[PDB]
Design an enzyme around this catalytic site. Structure first.
Site, PDB file in Angstrom:
ATOM      1  N   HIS A 133      -5.158   9.504  -1.076  1.00  0.00           N
ATOM      2  CA  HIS A 133      -5.388   7.679  -1.750  1.00  0.00           C
ATOM      3  C   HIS A 133      -4.386   6.942  -1.770  1.00  0.00           C
ATOM      4  O   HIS A 133      -3.401   7.476  -2.360  1.00  0.00           O
ATOM      5  CB  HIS A 133      -6.558   7.719  -2.817  1.00  0.00           C
ATOM      6  CG  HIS A 133      -5.892   8.115  -4.469  1.00  0.00           C
ATOM      7  ND1 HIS A 133      -5.277   7.702  -5.382  1.00  0.00           N
ATOM      8  CD2 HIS A 133      -6.063   9.727  -4.264  1.00  0.00           C
ATOM      9  CE1 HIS A 133      -4.124   8.131  -5.780  1.00  0.00           C
ATOM     10  NE2 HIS A 133      -4.832  10.094  -5.218  1.00  0.00           N
ATOM     11  N   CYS A 134      -4.804   5.598  -1.466  1.00  0.00           N
ATOM     12  CA  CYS A 134      -3.985   4.531  -1.757  1.00  0.00           C
ATOM     13  C   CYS A 134      -3.968   4.537  -3.257  1.00  0.00           C
ATOM     14  O   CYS A 134      -5.307   4.742  -4.071  1.00  0.00           O
ATOM     15  CB  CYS A 134      -4.205   3.363  -1.240  1.00  0.00           C
ATOM     16  SG  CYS A 134      -2.740   2.267  -1.643  1.00  0.00           S
ATOM     17  N   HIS A 169      -7.629   0.018  -4.868  1.00  0.00           N
ATOM     18  CA  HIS A 169      -7.329   0.185  -3.798  1.00  0.00           C
ATOM     19  C   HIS A 169      -8.409   1.228  -3.422  1.00  0.00           C
ATOM     20  O   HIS A 169      -9.384   0.949  -2.386  1.00  0.00           O
ATOM     21  CB  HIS A 169      -5.713   0.365  -3.954  1.00  0.00           C
ATOM     22  CG  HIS A 169      -5.162   0.005  -3.364  1.00  0.00           C
ATOM     23  ND1 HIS A 169      -4.185  -0.977  -2.522  1.00  0.00           N
ATOM     24  CD2 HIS A 169      -4.542  -1.168  -4.234  1.00  0.00           C
ATOM     25  CE1 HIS A 169      -3.741  -2.061  -2.802  1.00  0.00           C
ATOM     26  NE2 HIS A 169      -4.168  -2.371  -3.766  1.00  0.00           N
ATOM     27  N   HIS A 171      -3.320  14.903  -2.316  1.00  0.00           N
ATOM     28  CA  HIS A 171      -3.658  15.579  -3.264  1.00  0.00           C
ATOM     29  C   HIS A 171      -2.848  17.176  -2.641  1.00  0.00           C
ATOM     30  O   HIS A 171      -2.410  17.916  -3.603  1.00  0.00           O
ATOM     31  CB  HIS A 171      -4.410  15.814  -3.765  1.00  0.00           C
ATOM     32  CG  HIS A 171      -5.055  14.219  -4.618  1.00  0.00           C
ATOM     33  ND1 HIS A 171      -6.135  14.669  -4.956  1.00  0.00           N
ATOM     34  CD2 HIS A 171      -4.865  13.455  -5.107  1.00  0.00           C
ATOM     35  CE1 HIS A 171      -6.962  13.218  -5.888  1.00  0.00           C
ATOM     36  NE2 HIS A 171      -5.171  12.507  -5.506  1.00  0.00           N
ATOM     37  N   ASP A 225      -1.044   8.642  -1.872  1.00  0.00           N
ATOM     38  CA  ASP A 225      -1.344  10.119  -2.607  1.00  0.00           C
ATOM     39  C   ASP A 225      -1.840  11.324  -1.809  1.00  0.00           C
ATOM     40  O   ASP A 225      -2.755  10.796  -1.485  1.00  0.00           O
ATOM     41  CB  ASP A 225      -1.421   9.540  -3.893  1.00  0.00           C
ATOM     42  CG  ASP A 225      -1.775  10.947  -4.790  1.00  0.00           C
ATOM     43  OD1 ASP A 225      -1.392  11.350  -4.748  1.00  0.00           O
ATOM     44  OD2 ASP A 225      -1.945  10.313  -6.431  1.00  0.00           O
ATOM     45  N   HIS A 264     -26.694  17.936  -2.177  1.00  0.00           N
ATOM     46  CA  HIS A 264     -27.803  18.393  -2.115  1.00  0.00           C
ATOM     47  C   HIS A 264     -28.102  19.366  -0.426  1.00  0.00           C
ATOM     48  O   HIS A 264     -28.465  17.795  -0.162  1.00  0.00           O
ATOM     49  CB  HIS A 264     -28.803  17.555  -2.565  1.00  0.00           C
ATOM     50  CG  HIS A 264     -29.934  18.984  -2.647  1.00  0.00           C
ATOM     51  ND1 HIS A 264     -30.524  19.789  -2.872  1.00  0.00           N
ATOM     52  CD2 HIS A 264     -31.613  18.204  -2.510  1.00  0.00           C
ATOM     53  CE1 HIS A 264     -31.674  20.629  -2.461  1.00  0.00           C
ATOM     54  NE2 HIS A 264     -32.177  18.785  -2.838  1.00  0.00           N
ATOM     55  N   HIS A 300       0.788  -1.322   0.421  1.00  0.00           N
ATOM     56  CA  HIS A 300      -0.033   0.153   0.139  1.00  0.00           C
ATOM     57  C   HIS A 300       1.026   0.994  -0.240  1.00  0.00           C
ATOM     58  O   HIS A 300       2.102   1.363   0.442  1.00  0.00           O
ATOM     59  CB  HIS A 300      -1.060  -0.167   1.605  1.00  0.00           C
ATOM     60  CG  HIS A 300      -2.180  -0.858   1.056  1.00  0.00           C
ATOM     61  ND1 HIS A 300      -2.711  -1.089   0.743  1.00  0.00           N
ATOM     62  CD2 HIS A 300      -1.858  -1.943   1.883  1.00  0.00           C
ATOM     63  CE1 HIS A 300      -4.088  -1.764   0.848  1.00  0.00           C
ATOM     64  NE2 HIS A 300      -3.294  -3.016   1.233  1.00  0.00           N
ATOM     65  N   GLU A 334     -28.124  25.508  -4.675  1.00  0.00           N
ATOM     66  CA  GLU A 334     -28.804  24.497  -4.767  1.00  0.00           C
ATOM     67  C   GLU A 334     -28.144  23.166  -4.266  1.00  0.00           C
ATOM     68  O   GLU A 334     -28.811  22.476  -3.396  1.00  0.00           O
ATOM     69  CB  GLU A 334     -30.473  24.534  -4.938  1.00  0.00           C
ATOM     70  CG  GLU A 334     -30.183  23.819  -6.382  1.00  0.00           C
ATOM     71  CD  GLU A 334     -31.067  23.964  -7.883  1.00  0.00           C
ATOM     72  OE1 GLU A 334     -31.728  23.824  -7.433  1.00  0.00           O
ATOM     73  OE2 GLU A 334     -30.988  25.227  -8.501  1.00  0.00           O
ATOM     74  N   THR A 335     -27.329  22.760  -5.451  1.00  0.00           N
ATOM     75  CA  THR A 335     -26.543  21.859  -5.452  1.00  0.00           C
ATOM     76  C   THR A 335     -25.265  21.943  -6.148  1.00  0.00           C
ATOM     77  O   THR A 335     -25.424  23.027  -6.901  1.00  0.00           O
ATOM     78  CB  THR A 335     -27.479  20.980  -6.879  1.00  0.00           C
ATOM     79  OG1 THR A 335     -28.950  20.605  -6.195  1.00  0.00           O
ATOM     80  CG2 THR A 335     -26.647  19.752  -6.441  1.00  0.00           C
ATOM     81  N   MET A 388      -9.377   2.630  -0.172  1.00  0.00           N
ATOM     82  CA  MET A 388      -8.749   3.441   0.169  1.00  0.00           C
ATOM     83  C   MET A 388      -8.521   5.203  -0.071  1.00  0.00           C
ATOM     84  O   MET A 388      -6.958   4.938  -0.907  1.00  0.00           O
ATOM     85  CB  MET A 388      -7.421   2.982   0.470  1.00  0.00           C
ATOM     86  CG  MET A 388      -6.328   2.332   1.218  1.00  0.00           C
ATOM     87  SD  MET A 388      -5.196   1.014   0.830  1.00  0.00           S
ATOM     88  CE  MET A 388      -4.361   1.407   2.461  1.00  0.00           C
ATOM     89  N   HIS A 414     -26.889  14.321  -5.510  1.00  0.00           N
ATOM     90  CA  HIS A 414     -28.934  14.542  -6.387  1.00  0.00           C
ATOM     91  C   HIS A 414     -28.970  13.664  -7.196  1.00  0.00           C
ATOM     92  O   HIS A 414     -29.985  14.037  -8.535  1.00  0.00           O
ATOM     93  CB  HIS A 414     -29.393  15.942  -6.037  1.00  0.00           C
ATOM     94  CG  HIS A 414     -30.476  16.089  -6.041  1.00  0.00           C
ATOM     95  ND1 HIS A 414     -31.441  16.129  -6.630  1.00  0.00           N
ATOM     96  CD2 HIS A 414     -30.818  16.480  -5.280  1.00  0.00           C
ATOM     97  CE1 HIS A 414     -33.099  16.006  -6.248  1.00  0.00           C
ATOM     98  NE2 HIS A 414     -32.717  17.410  -5.631  1.00  0.00           N
TER      99      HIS A 414
END
Ligand SMILES: [Cu+2]
Ligand SMILES: [Cu+2]
Ligand SMILES: [Cu+2]
Ligand SMILES: [Cu+2]
Ligand SMILES: [Cu+2]
Ligand SMILES: [Cu+2]
Ligand SMILES: [Mg+2]
Ligand SMILES: [Mg+2]
Ligand SMILES: [Mg+2]
Ligand SMILES: [Mg+2]
Ligand SMILES: [Mg+2]
Ligand SMILES: [Mg+2]
Ligand SMILES: [Mg+2]
Ligand SMILES: [Mg+2]
Ligand SMILES: [Mg+2]
Lengths: 328, 328, 328
Positions: free
Chosen positions: C123-124, C134, C88, C86, C244, C83, C268-269, C139, C295
């Site tokens: 994330h892996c 993964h 970001h 990463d 939403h 494993h 709204e969304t 993950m 939504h």
């Protein structure tokens, strides 16, 4: 406050209104009847539909920010299902959903304050799995809450439209026989389990404007003139869309649909998030036919998400010219 | 106005240009030949392709806002289909689509004014179901219309790139036998019905950069140096994408791709709407390998949407350091 | 610099922190154990999961821009797979992926500088097809890098939240028997080929918040009070979402999740791009139940992407009132 009673008009048109509020806050009175009916989506494709006021989408409501909205919602005795309404424009009780559940034979009146400017989805949401099902059976529309002083651009300058068209885009999930032909049912309940199976794939059988394939083409084509500023209000209550005016642009675009946010300019294609309404203003510069499409072109052409706009006026060679005709 | 003839260069590269227009408006002359051919997408996967200039995507055109574009488009007699071109950069006649329909054996010359700054999709759109089909057979590229004074940031400050790479992402719908292996045909028409069936599921068999799985990895990897400002122009003519530079960011990002709109900063992942081109500028700070991917990682890895960037330069421990190596 | 050791707390909660950095830059010390285990997604649906710290999503880390992050990552000997991680948020070596690959039985310590404000996915990403696999096995988590002076609105005014909730949304691809029931395996490897087949359709079997259907409903419902400003930090490491708050709005929304960009208002969304985290602030104005949903309502209800929020306080009839109760 003054009370104003509105006569709703079917989409893609809009009831009489003024962009700059002619008065201070008013209470806006609307009434809608829920109509359950089988509707033809395409040549051999039918939907056991559930509708606000008999149309897909439900009709456009237009009010101003700070106004109130009083909706009388009627569920006639011929209907089979309970129904309600969730205004994304509203604050509280699941957008009104928790105050508007009505059985066949009942009516309800909801009031809410339109505290926020923008185009908003309204949609049925009775509870649990009924929620997606009523929506994908056609039970959604839009309310547009204009700023009291009308629309403003990215620099705060007043802007005005000549015409608003309400484009309601809806994804549907019609069950198929093994040979790819579509199934028919006696009522929505009969079709429910087979529809759920399609829903679970997340693949719409049809994605349409104004409730049917070709609703807004042919005799249904939208109309405009060179010079017209047209606001295209576009809702999608359940799934994403990427609107495109072929041969044009979005001059000013609020893709998330809330008018106090600065719009983007010069867009080729914009994005309506599933569960929202956006709006795009364009001034037509050239005559001829345009297509307004979801630019997943498979969605536009195979699934049904294509409208045409027929524009009259004078051609401008400075913008475009065929210098050498097809030859060989 | 001065006329300027361009020699187009295959993607991901770009023909010679200057970011700040060296002259006032000019008429830009481009020529492209439509090439119909079977192309290898992956080890045992082929597409009956339809291409602008033999590449997927079609080559990048670069002009300045207020310039004109004169495209000579050629459909050689060996081709089987009519074709045309829709410039999302253009105003009128379905982006030029309605003025450029040519049969095998014909050529056409279209002029349009590039009135709007930004990266835009161009794509074939002959009419009806031919529209999605020609696009998903590879018939799309990009034209980048730079502001005459070059790019500007969210504060109106001039910004400059060292390198532009054109990343054309394309979704394809190759029919499969029951065992999951891909079907082969003698020509695009032979494969049409089976392709439509895949298209209707909305599930691409392949989603690729520069026309094939691994086109931009291995020997095809992109190259840069620490300190380089690289503009990644990313088109997707039919379906959404969510680009990500693994190990980097978007320093300035116009995800809707129109340069007079303020870019967002510091993005991890951005969004290219199907039917559009966006652009992201990054200054490389660390050496080593990067991957530029559609961050639906299934789309990136299983479907083909992965490019590599190999960056040379000096490592900066202040930004990142392995304090304790794997141990145990 | 000062060193600060954090005790991580499971999602949707957040470890102790201050919005306005109480100090200048510090080195933030976090530790996580990778836990491979079968998890129940729904009544008769299980996932051979791979997790950071035993939760899906991995726990939320909160630091300030300009701080350093030192993560100790542990892959216990009982695990079967290598494993890595990463970030970001980080610059270089594939977000840390290229410096953190550890076999069962190993640990590693990575340091990086949090040079950019915003919510970011971690994330892996071990390499090749292991990458999507993964991630879709659970993950992934989020690190939120706050500006040193706290959040600011579209006008640069300081804003503050009372509560942050971390909503980790994850798409999963559980293989099915012909009858639609879900398959069970002895370990992740045993299930790999059948999972790939589902992955290739791009259709999740389940899309969940906090690692399971109903994790954040019932006893798991989120809690708030009228007047509370709640920041909803929403990650989706692999696939798009459209959050939403039913009955509410996004007062300030950074849908791309990077805090120096101006937020949009009154949404709204909004839209979380696959491979990113966004954030939305709302001040609750009405008591009662709310639902926070993806939504695409099929995704919300059939797939699992629904959370509830229970809000206590006083009802405001000015915002909404049931004028006429259901009657007939
Ligand atoms: Cu209903
Ligand atoms: Cu809703
Ligand atoms: Cu063509
Ligand atoms: Cu187009
Ligand atoms: Cu892993
Ligand atoms: Cu990533
Ligand atoms: Mg009536
Ligand atoms: Mg039949
Ligand atoms: Mg204008
Ligand atoms: Mg040539
Ligand atoms: Mg075969
Ligand atoms: Mg910079
Ligand atoms: Mg611990
Ligand atoms: Mg079974
Ligand atoms: Mg406020």
């Amino acid at each position: 406050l003054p009370r104003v009673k509105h006569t709703l008009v079917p989409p893609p048109f809009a009831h009489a209104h003024e962009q700059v509020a002619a008065s201070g806050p008013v209470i806006n009175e609307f009434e809608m009847r829920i109509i359950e009916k089988e509707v033809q989506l395409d040549e051999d494709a039918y939907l056991q539909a559930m509708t606000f006021d008999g149309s897909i989408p439900g009709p456009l409501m237009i009010v101003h920010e700070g106004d109130y909205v009083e909706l009388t919602l009627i569920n006639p005795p011929e209907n089979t299902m309970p129904h309600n309404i969730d205004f994304h424009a509203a604050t509280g009780a699941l957008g009104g959903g928790g105050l508007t559940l009505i059985n066949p034979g009942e009516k309800v009146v909801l009031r809410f304050k339109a505290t926020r400017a923008g185009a908003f989805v309204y949609h049925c949401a009775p509870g649990g799995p009924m929620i997606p099902w009523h929506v994908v059976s056609g039970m959604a529309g839009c309310i547009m809450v204009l700023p009291r002083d009308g629309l403003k651009d990215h620099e705060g300058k007043p802007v005005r439209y000549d015409t608003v068209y309400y484009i309601g885009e809806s994804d549907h999930y019609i069950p198929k026989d093994e040979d790819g032909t579509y199934m028919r049912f006696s009522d929505p309940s009969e079709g429910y389990e087979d529809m759920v199976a399609v829903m679970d794939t997340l693949i719409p059988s049809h994605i349409v404007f104004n409730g049917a394939v070709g609703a807004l083409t042919g005799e249904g084509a939208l109309k405009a003139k060179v010079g017209d500023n047209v606001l295209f209000v576009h809702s999608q209550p359940n799934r994403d869309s990427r609107p495109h005016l072929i041969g044009g642009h979005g001059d000013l675009v609020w893709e998330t649909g809330k008018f106090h946010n600065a719009p983007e300019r010069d867009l080729e294609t914009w994005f309506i998030r599933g569960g929202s309404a956006g709006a795009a203003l364009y001034k037509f510069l050239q005559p001829g036919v345009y297509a307004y499409v979801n630019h997943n072109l498979i969605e536009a052409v195979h699934k049904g998400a294509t409208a045409h706009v027929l524009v009259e006026g004078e051609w401008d060679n400075d913008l475009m010219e065929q210098v050498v005709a097809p030859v060989g």
